[model samples]
Target chain A: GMENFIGSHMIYTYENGWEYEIYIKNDHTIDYRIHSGMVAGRWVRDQEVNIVKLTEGVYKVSWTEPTGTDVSLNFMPNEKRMHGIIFFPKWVHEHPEITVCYQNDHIDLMKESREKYETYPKYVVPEFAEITFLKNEGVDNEEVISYAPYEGMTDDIRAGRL
Target chain B: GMENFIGSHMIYTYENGWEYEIYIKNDHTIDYRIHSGMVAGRWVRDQEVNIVKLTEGVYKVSWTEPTGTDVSLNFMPNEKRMHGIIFFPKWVHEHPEITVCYQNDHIDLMKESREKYETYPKYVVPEFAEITFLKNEGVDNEEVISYAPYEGMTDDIRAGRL
Candidate 1:
């Protein structure tokens, strides 16, 4: 379900199989906590957003990073529920192991590793999971949806160790 | 206009407009100097790659960062040049101002005060110039081809100080 994230929180997964929790404060600004990937993983402080209403139910959610990276999320609101894609072009390039297309899908580590590094001289793997927002539920607290496949990676996958 | 960057060094840019000078060593590994973005802007140490020959002139360039970021570049031998994108999925989610699409191109600082706070509610502006590797002469020294448009950004763009 969706509370427009105005007074709620959300959890999402990416194409690379990582997950994040976004808590939307009353002010419409967002505070997101990355559960997977680098840096001891915690809620980054005060990530802001601008909502542009495209139609009655569809809206464009935009985020800007301090370094000047901007991300756009297409929000399709339905029955008070929200579903969409978090577009990250660079992620798609780097994680060829996963399907480059956008969607909130599970990553087959074995398959992605094999295909992505198949032609390369060395094994190149994805350590930080890819992100694509799939679903969101309005809630009060952030939840740990699932664990990453970090431990499941094989020796060959871990060989390159980037 | 181009050096294959395998037996010689090459400079390339990304669709996101950032630039990198890749030094291809005799070992077929790579050492690169980043001219812009997020860091102090220097040559990162120990970044390595393994080059693979796919066909006559076609090759694959692969790199891995210690933190688990892998980038793949395709060397189209016919062009006597190479073109490909770098994948840092996690990096993209963290960085917003940059477009996710890949090739390279190329940023800026403000006047003392403007550079310090070019954004609102926080310091989110990028201070360093954006990078794009335009030419490579296979020399030991790196060159600055142009300056960033830091001076041209509007006051609103400079709202974030960081």
Candidate 2:
């Protein structure tokens, strides 16, 4: 369950030059803040985070943000590393400008259609970042990554892989 | 509801050199195929496609593949454009080598943890591709993407944004 993370405060530093922190408050409620990176300073609470036990000391943590940003991360405390993938889904509702990422990495983000009634779509990108667990913010200093090569997932069978 | 798309077949060409095709089977059923791209020739059927009416001519479509690949797309027939975001969630199940995306874009995609009992997390990538609509494969010729920039989805009021 969330027992392993209930009172833990951890920070992740990605190879993509992104820094994010999370404080697993209690139960299913969580507080998230981006120290630096694309959506720096963006934070939220009570994210309804979902945790799945993949193996001993390895867990899958995921959540969806108000921005339709869906995040899935593999946390490995024993191995001192993690990997993550994020999805920014474009939507129709007219949103406030502050939550939007106008330009990232010094590049103009994207623009919506002029239909007024509709917004543009959000496409899928392959970020694929492996991380090194620096340290628990509540405990000490930092450092790291998953989803290394996808095992021959598909053609294996009609069951499920990848 | 799904009336407008129940019997329609369409193809999308992404700006990132990816091509995909889909046939609306019946009811909520669909058949998907990739003509060319990352996982080219990868096809599946009976995908439980979900459609949401965002506007008159604009719709939000999405589905999850058998391989845990969740995809969300925005379709616009009026503007001849669509955008998509896909999430390939990692897993604990040991999968066959086929469904896995080992190498893509000429680079090794990713790998899993050593523990065979668990898999790494599937991180989210920003694949904001604006697509152009090609002809429906059932009808004739082809061509392209969504999810444009997400509307300021978060800071609006904490209700929802992104």
Candidate 3:
């Protein structure tokens, strides 16, 4: 079989097409995951895993996490913000790239394509820093605003890569 | 005075910190002026203009066009969706090179920038292109996706300036 990550652990109760399982780890974080446009979890690590089942074709799940909370098998779902655009069933598995992270906030996703980025036009590659400022505190949020670089520029403009 | 826009007809409204307005032509066509975000037309265009100020900070303005139809306006806030995130706001503004068009199935916002795209890193200079796609079209509308380019990338990869 295939060992894939729908993400950390939780059960999602859906009505019609499919079902889902979500997993949460760190506290103070909300994992917005979905299945075919279905929203589940604003997962809160400190809270209980939330589950919701809508009419035969709809459902919702949401929760919040406080700081210092460690979660292992907490199931959470997003109540809002996941639907049409992200719910294309057949395409979902094939098009994770649909996740469009712009500006500095979306750099973590770039790591998924390391081999593809290493080929050439290397000048436009993403940064290779160790830790990002967002993971820490007190750094200027506005200083590294340019999320993507032009063709020949270096990754120094951005804080880190995915 | 904006001499170039002397003959341009427009209407505007002021609110908590933000002011909005619209532009309209005598023929009922929408004239989205640069200053305001919308166009001004005869309430319903060809109908009437009824202005009512409610509770000082709140108000309503509307009219019916010549079609004998009825139209009215009120002040209320709502949410929007862009690209993927939900609870998104209209916060919609585009540059000349960028155009946002609404269609029966989705919304297409097109723009070009100096940003380097993985597939097109050689153009180096900021050429123009259109980013056409849909945003905010379901139960959970969002203004942005969680995994935007810069937001979710890794620190090292994000640092590369390209």
Clash counts for all predictions: 34, 55, 93
Q: State the C-alpha lDDT per candidate.
A: 0.38, 0.45, 0.22
Identify the superior model by TM-score, candidate 1 or candidate 3: 1
lDDT-wise, the better of 1 and 3 is 1
lDDT of 1 by residue, B1-162 (tens): 124544444444444545555555534455555543543133432345555543344444555433223354544434534444333334333442342111123211111222232122222221111222223335333232122223322222234231
Docking class of 1: incorrect
Query: Tens digit of lDDT per residue, candidate 2, span B1-162?
Result: 346655556666677656565666654556655656455545555556655544355455565443445665655565566555555444413342344231232122222222222222444433324344333333121211111112331122123221
> Local error of candidate 2 at A12, Å?
30
Top candidate when judged by lDDT against the true structure: 2
lDDT (10s digit) by residue, model 2, range A1-162: 346545555566677656565655554555665556455545555556665444345455666543445665555565555555554443412442344331232122223222122222333332323343332323111111111112231122113221
**lDDT for each residue of candidate 1 in A1-162, tens digit (9 for 90 to 100):** 234535444444555545555555434356555555531143444456654433344433445433222343433334232333232223333553343211123335423443333221223331222223323334333332222323433222224242
